Enzyme design. Sequence first.
Site, PDB file in Angstrom:
ATOM      1  N   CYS A 107       0.821  -1.216   0.000  1.00 10.26           N
ATOM      2  CA  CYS A 107       0.000   0.000   0.000  1.00 10.26           C
ATOM      3  C   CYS A 107       0.861   1.274   0.000  1.00 10.26           C
ATOM      4  O   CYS A 107       1.628   1.515   0.930  1.00 10.26           O
ATOM      5  CB  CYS A 107      -0.923   0.014   1.218  1.00 10.26           C
ATOM      6  SG  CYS A 107      -1.990   1.447   1.223  1.00 10.26           S
ATOM      7  N   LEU A 108       0.708   2.070  -1.051  1.00 11.26           N
ATOM      8  CA  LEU A 108       1.500   3.273  -1.271  1.00 11.26           C
ATOM      9  C   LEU A 108       1.182   4.339  -0.215  1.00 11.26           C
ATOM     10  O   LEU A 108       2.071   5.047   0.242  1.00 11.26           O
ATOM     11  CB  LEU A 108       1.273   3.809  -2.697  1.00 11.26           C
ATOM     12  CG  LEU A 108       2.281   4.825  -3.280  1.00 11.26           C
ATOM     13  CD1 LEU A 108       3.751   4.321  -3.266  1.00 11.26           C
ATOM     14  CD2 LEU A 108       1.875   5.298  -4.730  1.00 11.26           C
TER      15      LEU A 108
END
Lengths: 152, 151
Positions: free
Chosen positions: A84-85
Amino acid sequence: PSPGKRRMDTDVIKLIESKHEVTILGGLNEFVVKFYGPQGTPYEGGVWKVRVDLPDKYPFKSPSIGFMNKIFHPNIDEASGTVCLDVINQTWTALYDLTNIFESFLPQLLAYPNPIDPLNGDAAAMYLHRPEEYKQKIKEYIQKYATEEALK
Amino acid sequence: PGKRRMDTDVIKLIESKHEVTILGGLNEFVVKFYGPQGTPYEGGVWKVRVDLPDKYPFKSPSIGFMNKIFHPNIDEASGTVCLDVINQTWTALYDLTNIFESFLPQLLAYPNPIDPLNGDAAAMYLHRPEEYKQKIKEYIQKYATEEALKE
Ligand code: NA
């Protein structure tokens, strides 16, 4: 070469010289690191190949991080392995030490997920409600996907 | 027996003064929580999410602040309350109404010296208590008023 580019090369060489085992792909903007599951977590015993890509705007823009072999975790998209960025961005800064992705960021993420707004809804639900199933699911994924055996 | 305890602990909480919203089932809900009087959190309002594990009450709930809070034992980004700190207070006879009446107000009054989830909050709490209070006040105005919760 730009300040960003000088930082890329310096950062990546620093990472290569660290205790972390690095394989370089197309160039210094794409490498893979052998990563070991942190002790005292359900990931303990696991071994992963973690691919890091550096954007052209590095280090202002964070690296992207993907597990090349399968992992079960609330904040990692299972099918792609992509971390997850938003989670990476909560930690990343323009001066953050690339080596700390492996020493600090990833061990802490695996030990303590954020099960709210997850990329793996299945893992998040098990994490919160069925911790023993969660742990066992991780152990089975380790045996199937994340042993030295499985990687060769 | 544990499941009987889950259902009746949750129904008791629903019946209590605490305002409960059930999410996917009785094992996950959000409770509206007011900062305790005489602490730096006085006057703040939070939505606190509780999740119950299948082996409840032998296993503790997990507890997260859904709108932001600045506290040493609470992860700022996720709102997660330190599970080790929870486990020090949790017993098999502890119930949910006391999470909100006893546990959380005592924790907000007295951060736990267990390795902090919020290092910045721990350092200020310990060495700059006045900045600790000011930063909490700023976070309340920003994240934890009735108005901030509407937005
Ligand atoms: Na109620």
